[PDB]
Design a protein around this ligand. Structure first.
Ligand SMILES: *C/C=C1/C(=C/C2=NC(=C\c3[nH]c(/C=C4\NC(=O)C(C=C)=C4C)c(C)c3CCC(=O)O)/C(CCC(=O)O)=C2C)NC(=O)C1C
Ligand SMILES: *C/C=C1/C(=C/C2=NC(=C\c3[nH]c(/C=C4\NC(=O)C(C=C)=C4C)c(C)c3CCC(=O)O)/C(CCC(=O)O)=C2C)NC(=O)C1C
Ligand SMILES: [Cl-]
Ligand SMILES: [Cl-]
Lengths: 490, 490
């Protein structure tokens, strides 16, 4: 039994079932004997009786078996389109070997389309993108038009594992999820693990009847690990979620950046849909190039941000050389430092005097805040996205300032440049429908986009957008510049 | 007993001895009772008999004890120059608290010099440096002229823990160590640990008589941890090394960059020398600013290198758009990719054809090398600084090519751009004296710069300069550019 209490630990890699759009045969490490097979092997390949025990040549024919062994020459599955059985029937075959077990997957051959041709057209239309924003926006549009799914989304994973919908292409009649968040729990760790192993993940029919693998567990008491099997059946928890949304089919493409799971490209269809192997090969290659291009664009953006910060700090260091009183320059200029680090407000605490710009804590709250900073800082940059966790009093003004980054501007006195961010929920740009409801099944209304978003919103109460690595290494460069010039002026 | 077999595990933090240029008093957590004291406490403070048992007020006076408690308001030692005892004598006092033990160190007061004044003059002369090279060169010169030591060196730590002498200022009559390396073993882990805890480290007299701490071990069987004590005595192994070099005194300043031990600024003197507390405070502050400035200059250099690589790859991608045959463009252009990554040679392996430029393996060695690359690469960047460890045959041509970085330039075929580096010892730029010999003591000739350099040279045989993080992330950006454009041309 699987329910909302144990589904964070569900063994989704050994479900003992496949999807009905193909059939599976498991063989020994060297592909001599047939250890396991799907119930629909007979119906689809045209074979009578149990196949477990019969030799590889006996079931498939000596002609085909020879070609499969040659291909095994790595857990990366081999794609063999338009192969032919002894019977004469045509099949697209996925072949892989994992935990010294050979798995063979059969699809009815729909191979009348060149895979490289499609992928090259697609990759050409994204290669010339000059920003992350331009790549993500055009990609959902492009995939929707090329693969013809009713909805295409891109999810980006936040630091805390939560997903954000950063791009959407949909049918006009469907509701928008653009700018909406889902919590980390909506995609368990074992699911993220498999998304990192498999580029592509297909669900042909959410309402389809799953086909069992025989035997479900062997003599040794070992289940069949379908980690790299494209026919692997899906969790009944996720199944119920898609049916509640009106989604019959899906296909997700894994976005790998610096060897980490950055996010997913996810295609939803309102009717059943399986893509042929040749189209899945093209989509996978598109996924690889999209991933590589986003990686370079992220690097280029990081670089530009740090360059801009250096130039800004140079401009300031030149002004500081021509002005006698440094304290007066800081009081006139401090708001300009808001251009270095994305913030909703910035403040200057110098000689027990406060000066604020934008969304900052109230005037009366600053001395307590400044004392706290002076105690924990230890003359280094200090940052939190959850200010109320450190100062319970700070809860009262979280709507204005939930996050703080503090920069020491003096080696000697306790003077600081303070950067502030409003709580995440204030900065929301949701494009969905508030009076949009969802049908539910046995498990409850937990498995609806409406409730997912509500759970996320509670998880990030009194918290701001976390300070990135780029934000912290700019803050550190600013600390050295300001401490440096403050020393010269004494 | 300590010798060349166990000195890698020597407990240098609990030697049970101090240096004779001051005296030490250990007290309880709250500084009520005197637990331990140095033998020379009596001789220097003018007190009769054992001090262990007598209360804090009894030994120092209620006047002074009150001022010391106030200062304790962190293992960072408090510097209290020109304090006065009940006796009327003047002392500079270092006060700290570690493992709930208070340690008080006394120096005869030579406080007739302003610490901030000296440091500000020094920091002004390094603040305007525009390259790492310009900072390191001017710093040895500046420190030598200001602090008046016979020799000033900067050691930079390599990836493998080995030290390189990257800057030198010396008396003309002394031998140069510029461009020389020492092995990781010449500074044990516990020494590097203490160098990270203490900015400054002083040895007043290598030939001085060490003063014991009484008791060396208390009732509980606990030794006195002198980790943060500036009077802590030095290993007799290092002692013998300095005496073999003709060095009587030293002072090292720790260079901390991105919270790691980057290297040391080390001052050597041929006669005994202790700097007064006010001068040590200035030197420490100089050390902090030198560290912060080098950190920014390293960041700026990394940035410029990656910027230059992007511009170069853009220039290439524009040529590739205007030229029909990409293979011919690569054969004409491949040598130009040597501007992206520091290398002694570069090569192109395309369509089972080889083209080389600079120091590369012999023509006949390439096919074996290309096959190996194709097996291990897995379509990612592959790099080693020790090629013979991976291919024993490669030992024969290590003088020409000891290191290899391989970039895949095709998604489909096994085509590669190969970068090569000669073995480290070929690229040596040693400025020392080959017929320069050293006197030795009990331990042997192991404790001489001549033998240290010889041991290092053996440690790095058949090895090249390791590929940096900057080298690998440029290689990765080049892979995406070349694989990207190679796809468009099919
Ligand atoms: C307790 C366990 C739960 C759970 C498990 C689970 N989720 C999986 C996949 C999955 N879930 C989401 C979430 C959403 N997709 C949406 O489109 C929206 C809202 C518009 C939400 C909230 C997503 C995105 C995914 C990935 C696939 C997809 O986007 O369609 C899986 C793995 C399913 C598989 O094998 O493919 C598991 C297991 N999900 C829960 O909500 C909960 C409570
Ligand atoms: C088996 C243990 C050994 C050892 C231990 C040790 N070394 C320490 C300090 C130290 N050693 C070096 C090495 C050199 N300094 C030079 O100037 C040259 C050559 C010109 C060499 C090879 C260095 C640089 C240092 C740091 C201080 C300095 O540079 O003067 C210490 C710690 C000493 C302390 O407490 O300050 C220990 C322990 N050294 C060995 O060579 C060996 C075999
Ligand atoms: Cl933009
Ligand atoms: Cl230079």
């Amino acid at each position: 039994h699987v329910d909302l209490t144990n589904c964070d630990r569900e063994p989704i890699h050994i479900p003992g079932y496949i999807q009905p759009h193909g059939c599976l045969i498991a063989c020994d490490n060297a592909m001599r004997m047939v250890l396991r097979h799907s119930e629909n092997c007979g119906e689809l390949l045209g074979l009578e009786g149990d196949l477990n025990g019969r030799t590889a040549e006996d079931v498939l024919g000596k002609r085909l078996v020879h070609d499969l062994r040659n291909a095994l020459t790595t857990t990366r599955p081999a794609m063999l389109p338009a192969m032919e059985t002894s019977d004469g029937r045509s099949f697209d075959i996925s072949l892989h070997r994992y935990k010294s077990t050979t798995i063979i997957e059969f699809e009815p051959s729909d191979s009348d389309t060149q895979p490289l041709g499609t992928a090259r057209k697609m990759v050409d239309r994204i290669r010339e993108a000059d920003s992350v924003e331009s790549l993500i926006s055009r990609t959902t549009r492009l995939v929707k038009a090329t693969l013809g799914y009713d909805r295409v989304l891109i999810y980006r994973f936040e630091e805390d594992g939560a997903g954000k919908v950063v791009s959407e292409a949909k049918q006009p009649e469907l509701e928008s999820f653009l700018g909406q968040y889902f919590p980390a729990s909506d995609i368990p760790q074992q699911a993220r693990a498999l998304y990192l192993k498999n580029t592509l993940r297909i669900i042909s029919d959410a309402s389809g009847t799953p086909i069992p693998v025989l035997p479900a567990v062997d003599v040794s008491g070992e289940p069949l690990d379908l980690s790299y099997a494209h026919l692997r059946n899906f969790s009944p928890i996720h199944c119920e979620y898609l049916r509640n949304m009106g989604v019959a089919a899906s296909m997700s493409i894994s976005v790998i950046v610096d060897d980490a799971l950055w996010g997913l490209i996810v295609c939803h269809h309102c009717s059943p849909r399986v893509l042929s192997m040749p189209v899945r090969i093209a989509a996978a290659m598109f996924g690889e190039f999209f991933s590589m291009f986003l990686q370079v664009l992220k690097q280029k953006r990081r670089l530009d941000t740090i360059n801009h910060a250096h130039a800004a700090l140079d401009r300031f260091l030149r002004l500081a050389a021509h002005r006698a009183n440094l304290e007066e320059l800081l009081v006139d200029s401090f708001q300009d430092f808001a251009r270095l680090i994305p913030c909703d407000g910035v403040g200057l605490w110098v000689g027990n005097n406060w000066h604020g710009h934008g969304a900052t804590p109230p005037h009366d709250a600053i001395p307590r805040l400044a004392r706290f900073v002076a105690s924990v800082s230890e003359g280094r940059v200090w940052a939190t996205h959850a200010l109320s966790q450190a100062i319970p009093e700070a809860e009262i003004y979280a709507d204005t300032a939930a996050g703080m980054l503090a920069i020491p501007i003096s080696q000697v006195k306790s003077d600081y440049l303070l950067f502030f961010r409003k709580e995440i929920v204030q900065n929301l740009n949701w494009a969905g429908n508030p009076e949009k409801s969802y049908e539910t099944g046995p498990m409850g209304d937990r498995l609806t986009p409406r409730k997912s978003f509500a759970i996320w919103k509670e998880s990030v109460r009194l918290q701001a957008q976390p300070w990135s690595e780029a934000d912290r290494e700019i803050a550190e460069t600013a600390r050295i510049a300001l401490v440096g010039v403050a020393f010269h002026h004494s």
